[PDB]
Amino acid sequence: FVPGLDGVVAFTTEIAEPDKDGGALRYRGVDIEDLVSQRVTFGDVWALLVDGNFGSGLPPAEPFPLPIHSGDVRVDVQAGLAMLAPIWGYAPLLDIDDATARQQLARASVMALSYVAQSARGIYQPAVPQRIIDECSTVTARFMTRWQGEPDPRHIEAIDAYWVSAAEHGMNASTFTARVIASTGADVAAALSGAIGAMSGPLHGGAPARVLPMLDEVERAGDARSVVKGILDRGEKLMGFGHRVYRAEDPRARVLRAAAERLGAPRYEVAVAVEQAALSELRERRPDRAIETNVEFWAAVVLDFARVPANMMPAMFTCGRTAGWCAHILEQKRLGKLVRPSAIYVGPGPRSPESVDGWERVLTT
Amino acid sequence: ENFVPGLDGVVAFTTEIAEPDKDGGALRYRGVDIEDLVSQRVTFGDVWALLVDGNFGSGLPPAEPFPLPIHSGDVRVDVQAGLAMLAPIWGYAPLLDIDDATARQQLARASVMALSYVAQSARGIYQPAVPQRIIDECSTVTARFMTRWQGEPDPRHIEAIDAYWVSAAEHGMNASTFTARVIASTGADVAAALSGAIGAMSGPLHGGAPARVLPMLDEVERAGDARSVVKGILDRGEKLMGFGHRVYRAEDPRARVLRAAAERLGAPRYEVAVAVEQAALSELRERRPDRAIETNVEFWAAVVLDFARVPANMMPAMFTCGRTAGWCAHILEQKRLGKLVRPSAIYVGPGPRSPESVDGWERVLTT
Known part of the structure; x- marks a missing residue:
C-alpha cells in the first residue's frame, strides 16, 4: 500500500493532454506552440480550456480596489477571491447551471488577475486610473498597465506567452484541490480560493x-x-x-x-x-x-x-494557472460526483476516557 | 475498465486519529467513543487536544484579542478569508520549515481564532464587541465562543454547542479533511490548509x-x-x-x-x-x-x-468550528507523513488539431 493516492487515476478529462512521451502539450487538442506562434492571447486561451472552443474570451475586470493588504500577494488573492461570493451573489455550484458557473468563473478569474496586479503595485502608491486600463485591448495588457502603469509592450508579450504556456498541465495539488471543493457543490470562489492555498505550498511544483x-x-x-x-x-x-x-x-x-x-x-x-x-x-x-x-x-x-520580482513570480504562475483551474472546476461540475476517498484506521482500540493519558488534569463541566 | 469516478472506496491514507466504525455503529476518537465524551461531558477544547495529540493534557487555548478584519456578509467566508491572513501577520512559515511542536502550537492558535472570528462575524457589525473581560470570565473555550457572540448566552445552549462540536469534530476522509491534508501535503502553512478546508466545507454536498x-x-x-x-x-x-x-x-x-x-x-x-x-x-x-x-x-x-440560536447561514461555519479538531489532527498527521498527494487523470479529449479547426476561431483577434 502506497499512501497519498500516488499512481491512482481520479478523473477522466478532456481539458488538455500533457503528452509527455510525445513531446507536446495540447490544450483541447491544440498545440501550445501553435497558440504562441499565432499570437493567441491568454484571454482567448482561457476560453479554449474552459469552454472547449474559441469565442468567449476572458472579459475585462470591473473596477474593484483590492480590500486585502496582508503583505503576501498569495494571501491577498486567496482571501479576496473567497470574499467575492457574498458581494457578487455567487450561489453554490449545485444550484446553478453550467453557463452561470462559466461567467462566475471568468468574472472571478480576471478579478484574481486584478487583485494580483494591485497587491504587487502596493498600497504606498496611487492606483493606476481605470481610464488608462481601458486603453488596453487584452487581459495581459490590462494586467501590466494596472500594475506598472507604463508597461513595455515587449514585456506584455512576454507575460502573455508565459501565461498560455503555464495555463494548464494535467493533475496537480492545486488543480486537485479546486476539483475537490467544486465536487462538494461549493461556489466557484470557494474552489478557486482553496486552490490558491494548495499552490502556495513549496512542494506543489x-x-x-x-x-x-x-x-x-x-x-x-x-x-x-x-x-x-x-x-x-x-x-x-x-x-x-x-x-x-x-x-x-x-x-x-x-x-x-x-x-x-x-x-x-x-x-x-x-x-x-x-x-x-x-x-x-x-x-x-x-x-x-x-x-x-x-x-x-x-x-x-x-x-x-x-520586471517581475522573485517574490512575485509565484503569483505570476498562479495567474496563468487560473485558466486550468476554471476549466477543471467547470468539468467537475458537469461530472457531478463528490470526491470522497477512504482511510483505514490503525489507531488505538476501544478504550474508556479514564485510561487515556492525561485524563487526571481534565475538568468536566 | 478499472476507473471509478470520485475516488469512491479507494484508500488514500491510514490514520490513528479516529475510527468511524460504520459496521459497529459507533464513532471513536483515538479509541474513545463520542457517546462517552458527551455523557461524561468533556469540553470541545479537550476533545481538540485528544484528536490532535492522541491524548488529553494540552487543552485548546483562549483566543487572543483580534478584531475581525473582514466583514463580507457571510460567516463562512469571513473565517475562511480571515484564517488565511493569520499567516503573514503571525509569521506562519510553511509546514516544511517548521517542526511538529511549532505546527501544533500554530494549529491550536488558529483554531481558536477561527472560533473567535465566527463569533464576531455572527454578532454582526451592528453590535459593539463584547469586552474581553467578560469573555475572560468563562471557563471553557465553548463558553468564550458563545459569550463573544451572544454576550449573555443561555447555559443550555452552551451545552448544546459543546455536544455538537464534539459530535462533529472528526469523521474520517470527508472532502474538507481530505482538502486540508492535500494542502498540507504541499507543505503550505497551516493557515492555508485550514482556509482551503473551509472552502470544501461550504459545499452543500459535504458529509x-x-x-x-x-x-x-x-x-x-x-x-x-x-x-x-x-x-x-x-x-x-x-x-x-x-x-x-x-x-x-x-x-x-x-x-x-x-x-x-x-x-x-x-x-x-x-x-x-x-x-x-x-x-x-x-x-x-x-x-x-x-x-x-x-x-x-x-x-x-x-x-x-x-x-x-444559530441561523441557517451560520450553520456551515458552526460545523467548520467543530471540525477544526479533525482538520488540525489530520494536518499534523499529514505533516509527519511527509509525502505529497499525487492523483492522476487520463486524457479522453480531442486529438491533435489546428487552431483554425476549433469552433469559434473566427472570433479571435490576433496581432
Missing part, C-alpha cells in the same frame, strides 16, 4: 525556479561553464535543471526560450549559456539519468525580463 | 452539512401534523431533507447524541423534530421497504444548532 542569483553569479564572473561546474562541486544543487519531464525538451521551455529570444530579453545570452553549460555538466557527471531544462528556468528569465 | 430542514419543521409546527406534511412532499415527488440511505449499519451514533441532547436540554423544537423523524422513517420505509433508511445526522445537527 511548477513555480518559476529561483535561478536569478545563479545568473547574477555569472554576470560578475564571465564564464557560465566555470560557475555551474563550481556550484556542483561545492555540494549545492543546480537550479532549473534535473530529471526529464517530457520525453525530450519540454515544449513549454521551448516557447519561453523562443519568446525571450524574439523579444530581445537582455539576459538571453547568459541564460542560454547557463542552459548549455548546466546540461553539459550534468549529463557528463550522470550519464545514467536524463537531464533537460526545467521550464521553470526559462519561466524565471521571461518573468524577470518583464 | 454532515446541516440540511435545510427548518422550512419543513416550520410547516409541521404550523399545520400540527407531521405525517401529512411528510406524506405530501413524497407524494409530490420532492426530496425529504435529512433522511436517506444509511451511513452506519443502523443509526448514526452522532444523530443519537444530538437527538438526546435536544431532549435533555429542553429544545422547544424537539417534539416537532422527533414527530418529523417518526413520520419520515415510517413513510420512507413503507414505500421502499427492502431499503436501509436511517435519519441523517444533518437533521439533528440542524435542530441542535437552531436550539442554540
Whole structure:
C-alpha cells in the first residue's frame, strides 16, 4: 500500500493532454506552440480550456480596489477571491447551471488577475486610473498597465506567452484541490480560493525556479561553464535543471526560450549559456539519468525580463494557472460526483476516557 | 475498465486519529467513543487536544484579542478569508520549515481564532464587541465562543454547542479533511490548509452539512401534523431533507447524541423534530421497504444548532468550528507523513488539431 493516492487515476478529462512521451502539450487538442506562434492571447486561451472552443474570451475586470493588504500577494488573492461570493451573489455550484458557473468563473478569474496586479503595485502608491486600463485591448495588457502603469509592450508579450504556456498541465495539488471543493457543490470562489492555498505550498511544483542569483553569479564572473561546474562541486544543487519531464525538451521551455529570444530579453545570452553549460555538466557527471531544462528556468528569465520580482513570480504562475483551474472546476461540475476517498484506521482500540493519558488534569463541566 | 469516478472506496491514507466504525455503529476518537465524551461531558477544547495529540493534557487555548478584519456578509467566508491572513501577520512559515511542536502550537492558535472570528462575524457589525473581560470570565473555550457572540448566552445552549462540536469534530476522509491534508501535503502553512478546508466545507454536498430542514419543521409546527406534511412532499415527488440511505449499519451514533441532547436540554423544537423523524422513517420505509433508511445526522445537527440560536447561514461555519479538531489532527498527521498527494487523470479529449479547426476561431483577434 502506497499512501497519498500516488499512481491512482481520479478523473477522466478532456481539458488538455500533457503528452509527455510525445513531446507536446495540447490544450483541447491544440498545440501550445501553435497558440504562441499565432499570437493567441491568454484571454482567448482561457476560453479554449474552459469552454472547449474559441469565442468567449476572458472579459475585462470591473473596477474593484483590492480590500486585502496582508503583505503576501498569495494571501491577498486567496482571501479576496473567497470574499467575492457574498458581494457578487455567487450561489453554490449545485444550484446553478453550467453557463452561470462559466461567467462566475471568468468574472472571478480576471478579478484574481486584478487583485494580483494591485497587491504587487502596493498600497504606498496611487492606483493606476481605470481610464488608462481601458486603453488596453487584452487581459495581459490590462494586467501590466494596472500594475506598472507604463508597461513595455515587449514585456506584455512576454507575460502573455508565459501565461498560455503555464495555463494548464494535467493533475496537480492545486488543480486537485479546486476539483475537490467544486465536487462538494461549493461556489466557484470557494474552489478557486482553496486552490490558491494548495499552490502556495513549496512542494506543489511548477513555480518559476529561483535561478536569478545563479545568473547574477555569472554576470560578475564571465564564464557560465566555470560557475555551474563550481556550484556542483561545492555540494549545492543546480537550479532549473534535473530529471526529464517530457520525453525530450519540454515544449513549454521551448516557447519561453523562443519568446525571450524574439523579444530581445537582455539576459538571453547568459541564460542560454547557463542552459548549455548546466546540461553539459550534468549529463557528463550522470550519464545514467536524463537531464533537460526545467521550464521553470526559462519561466524565471521571461518573468524577470518583464520586471517581475522573485517574490512575485509565484503569483505570476498562479495567474496563468487560473485558466486550468476554471476549466477543471467547470468539468467537475458537469461530472457531478463528490470526491470522497477512504482511510483505514490503525489507531488505538476501544478504550474508556479514564485510561487515556492525561485524563487526571481534565475538568468536566 | 478499472476507473471509478470520485475516488469512491479507494484508500488514500491510514490514520490513528479516529475510527468511524460504520459496521459497529459507533464513532471513536483515538479509541474513545463520542457517546462517552458527551455523557461524561468533556469540553470541545479537550476533545481538540485528544484528536490532535492522541491524548488529553494540552487543552485548546483562549483566543487572543483580534478584531475581525473582514466583514463580507457571510460567516463562512469571513473565517475562511480571515484564517488565511493569520499567516503573514503571525509569521506562519510553511509546514516544511517548521517542526511538529511549532505546527501544533500554530494549529491550536488558529483554531481558536477561527472560533473567535465566527463569533464576531455572527454578532454582526451592528453590535459593539463584547469586552474581553467578560469573555475572560468563562471557563471553557465553548463558553468564550458563545459569550463573544451572544454576550449573555443561555447555559443550555452552551451545552448544546459543546455536544455538537464534539459530535462533529472528526469523521474520517470527508472532502474538507481530505482538502486540508492535500494542502498540507504541499507543505503550505497551516493557515492555508485550514482556509482551503473551509472552502470544501461550504459545499452543500459535504458529509454532515446541516440540511435545510427548518422550512419543513416550520410547516409541521404550523399545520400540527407531521405525517401529512411528510406524506405530501413524497407524494409530490420532492426530496425529504435529512433522511436517506444509511451511513452506519443502523443509526448514526452522532444523530443519537444530538437527538438526546435536544431532549435533555429542553429544545422547544424537539417534539416537532422527533414527530418529523417518526413520520419520515415510517413513510420512507413503507414505500421502499427492502431499503436501509436511517435519519441523517444533518437533521439533528440542524435542530441542535437552531436550539442554540444559530441561523441557517451560520450553520456551515458552526460545523467548520467543530471540525477544526479533525482538520488540525489530520494536518499534523499529514505533516509527519511527509509525502505529497499525487492523483492522476487520463486524457479522453480531442486529438491533435489546428487552431483554425476549433469552433469559434473566427472570433479571435490576433496581432
